[PDB]
Assembly symmetry: D2
Homo-oligomer: 237 residues x 4
């Protein structure tokens, strides 16, 4: 199976598999059952921003999700990613719907990673910024239902001609280049990701969520990972 | 008196005022008696690098100091800087010598601060990088004994024609522009500073150290702050 | 006597002082009589973007001004800034109104300059970015009628409580820190500035314009430089 | 058939194919016969820096190559890359040796491109920086004889165990992700690249050179392109 580290913006409470009983953001370390969560006042139809940060000094993965003029939600978990992920990874965005649905629209996405070597104190870095997605976005790998180009946005899951989101959908976008996320011979390692999103649903409850994730380079959507599995894991273990 | 937050690279143990009994790095919150320290294998005559980071998600000020091919020293302290510093500040470097001495040479210094507003999710940012200091460096405010231009370096404390460091010296350099370090209406605030340094001493023990500091805008060297006070505080309270 | 290099967004044709007979963008080298202009279809009450670039390899100062979904206007001029500007400068935005008026509203402003030295091949850099301006913005020097804070914007010229621009006004905002824009011992020097602006004339008869400028560090608004002089020059020579 | 735009650091005069009779830097547009060259005083065994710049406002591709404490060599050429390159490309470094040889060692390589769209005035950006290359560098596509890891450097052409360069060699390194270098609906597009290199000929008779290049995404080393062809072209036309 793939190795997955993710920050989930989980719009639907699946209490049967350990979700808390409210929309929430979570830190996922090789399991969809978040190691840490925080309650998230998700706002149906509004544009929100997610900010995710990690550095190898504190060894702490944190995320903040917010909407304009509202209190933000924050969640943090102590984790040495050297012991979790492979040295080289891809980074990506994932989303899904199930029996309930929502749009999982990405308006923008940026990422920066840096590695300062122990032997020279010089840095390696990667940065990308997408404020517009085009129809044939060659620096992204799209998987499953994800498409680009509609209003210059990345639609992670399926939306119809008129704008209605569809159920039982799953899709992901990964940045084309592998990222060197840790190195044993590095004095300081760090990364941050930011993305803006629009989750809209005509349903009685929205579902299922969006995740920023870091995985083995050849990661692909596990079969049967629509709904509560967020396109990230093959099961709820 | 001035309000001071600093990370000290303390080369001399003044156990009489609470220093541990070895060279150390420390986090100083309105006192020269560090809230937290870590032992620091300081290397006489070698170029080292200091990295300092803070973000308002974790509310944690950390620093890592290292030399090439050696284990680094790291120190962290939880502190909500909103409750410590004024909203606007200057940032700077300070150093001193006392009855023992050392060069306090800065080879390079960079800094980046960012503020993401709560109402718009757009960012304000400041970044500077100095890899060379010139004789008349108008974007720096020099205080006390600090000079620029000699081999393109910033000499924080007094050095003679031939290279010998002098005792009872104190000097500082602050970036000219005020920095907006926190804002109540900001969703995420963060900063980082990096500097490379060369501390060399002909003495039986080097003294006294170098600090990166953040202070009220009109901060100036308190009188009698040579030696153990690092050009930062008017006394050892 | 001030030394000014500027890019003007000139909304009002003063044909008696050499303006072309339509709204225009221009490159001003020590004179309001632009060395080069281009026709500019300004859009009353719409947000526009101006981007300015120079490097010491091509020694060509270029600017592009545009509105979403319209054709840009571009102007360039070969000039060796080493021979025009002092080595250290301040950078700023300026605007004015005279018998006729307009809002001279700045929504965002960013700037980056870099100098790479001949001897070490390392870089000094300054970067700032304002997407929000606050009431008491300590890293800006405001002059004349310029104010910050209203709607998070910089209003360079006078606007009343009910939103209407006033005539006979002039105002400027300069970045607090001096900038080292050229150095004879540097291998490559470059800068760029970007700002977004909202120029609105409720009568559809706007004047006088907005400029990005670079000046001697101690530059102040010249006597009488409301109207056609854009807050930049003491006369129309 | 590959489409190549490149800046060559040509260490060996092939006067039978249009090289000038001295070592030179050149701008190559779909041909090894540079559209513009400049004399280059290469310094055997010293670390040099090459800097390359282009923006869509001036549409001028310029390069500067220098060594510490020497006069730079500069070359520029007006070219509308929109009409030469495909919209998506890869960027790379390339080098070769033929009857004569030299080390074609790369110590660091950085690249940034930005595209600002006509419709929203927002930017897409890619930036990478390598100051250290590692043995198994997954964000580089290496071709031919190019290797990474030795002393943290990229060796583009063959070097033996005892440090001597080999003849008849060719190698390239391309950044893994495709780059969107132009887009007809963008208001401003720009890129820049910088690399540092160490070209050493133990006999003081070096060949053949190093290039920074931009190519169709699926570009491979053309058949026979060791020697004068720099790993870039299938013939000398
Ligand atoms: Ca769920
Ligand atoms: Ca001490
Ligand atoms: Ca005019
Ligand atoms: Ca040749
Ligand atoms: Mn969950
Ligand atoms: Mn101490
Ligand atoms: Mn004019
Ligand atoms: Mn040639």
């Amino acid at each position: 199976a793939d190795t997955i580290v993710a920050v989930e913006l989980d719009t639907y409470p699946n209490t049967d598999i350990g979700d808390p009983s409210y929309p929430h953001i979570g830190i996922d370390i090789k399991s969809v059952r978040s190691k840490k969560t925080a309650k998230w006042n998700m706002q149906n139809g509004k544009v929100g921003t997610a900010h995710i940060i990690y550095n190898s000094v504190d060894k702490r993965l944190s995320a903040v999700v917010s909407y304009p003029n509202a209190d933000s939600a924050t969640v943090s978990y102590d984790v040495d990613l050297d012991n979790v992920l492979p040295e080289w990874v891809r980074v990506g965005l994932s989303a899904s719907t199930g029996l309930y649905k929502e749009t999982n629209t990405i308006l923008s996405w940026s990422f920066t990673s840096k590695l300062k070597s122990n032997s020279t104190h010089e840095t390696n870095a990667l940065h990308f910024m997408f404020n517009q997605f085009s129809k044939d976005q060659k620096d992204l790998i799209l998987q499953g239902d994800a498409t680009t180009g509609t209003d210059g946005n990345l639609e992670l899951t399926r939306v119809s001609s008129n704008g209605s989101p569809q159920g039982s959908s799953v899709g992901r976008a990964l940045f084309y280049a592998p990222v060197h996320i840790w190195e044993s011979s590095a004095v300081v390692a760090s990364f941050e990701a930011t993305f803006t999103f629009l989750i809209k649903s005509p349903d009685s409850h929205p579902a299922d969520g969006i995740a920023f994730f870091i995985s083995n380079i050849d990661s692909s959507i596990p079969s049967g990972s629509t709904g509560r599995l967020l396109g990230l894991f093959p099961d709820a273990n």
